[PDB]
Every structure is written in C-alpha cells, then in structure tokens.
Design a protein around this nucleic acid. Structure first.
Lengths: 63, 63
DNA sequence: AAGTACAAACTTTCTTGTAT
DNA sequence: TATACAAGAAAGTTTGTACT
C-alpha cells in the first residue's frame, strides 16, 4: 500500500519516523499518519520518494 | 511556473482544459485551479504528468 | 528516555454550480 | 463552446500531548 511500502522502506534505511520527516522537511506526525493509513496522498509525495529513493509511481502502486 | 508549464503543454498537445481533465481523471474546474495558480500540490500531480507525459519533477521544478 | 500515536483546529485542494 | 469564479466540504497538515 503506500502506507506500508513506505514503513518497510523507511526501515531498510534505518531512519525512524522522526528523521525521515527531518529529510522531507515535515512533521513527525505527518510521516506517521501516512504509514498508519490515515492519508492517501501526502502533498509531500515527491519529497518522500527522493528520500526513500524510489519513484512516486512505485510508492503509489507498488508496481 | 507550475501553472505556466502545465498550460503550455496542453496547448501544445492540442487539448483543451476538460479533455485533458477527463484524461487526467479530474475536472475542468481543477485544471483551472492549478493552471490559474489556484493550486500548487494537486492530488493528481502524478496522474497528470503521465497524462501530460512529462516528469513530475518537471511540473514543480521544471527541472 | 526515545519514538510512535492521537485528536482537534486550521489550511489547501476538490467538487459542483453557475457566471463570463 | 471554452475558461473562470466562488462557497461548502474533505482531504491533508499542525501542534501540542499522550502513550508505551
């Protein structure tokens, strides 16, 4: 899902949610809600795909 | 400018607002908020760049 | 301590209807 | 016909707190 892919992703890189956000330049909260399934399309969607270093499509559809 | 660029392709590509909208899966009225600086980060940024057949970075950074 | 969640108030982006 | 405006709501963001 986008929420899941992200959580696993954010982990192969070790970043906890607090530093992940640090990197997209956004709250710890916002990173949370996303993982948690309480947001489908975080306005910061291209900022976090840089970070995970995967491409938005992949993040979005899991390809 | 996000909306510059956007506008300019549609004219290029030969469609009007609606078309493309119906194409992007959105609305004539949405293609306006964006196009007319009324929107920055659309929930269709992505679905639009494929439609718009250019890069999502390109829409924002135009880079 | 450290890190992940929660929930309310506010903000942007969407949606529908009509005006130009 | 084709682009624009405008009011209500929804989807996201915030920020302060709370859990564990």
């Amino acid at each position: 899902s986008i929420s899941s892919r992200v959580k696993s992703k954010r982990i192969q890189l070790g970043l906890n949610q607090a530093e992940l956000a640090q990197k997209v330049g956004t709250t710890q909260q916002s990173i949370e809600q996303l993982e948690n399934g309480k947001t489908k399309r975080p306005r910061f969607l291209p900022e976090l795909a840089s970070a995970l270093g995967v491409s938005v499509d992949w993040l979005l559809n899991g390809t």
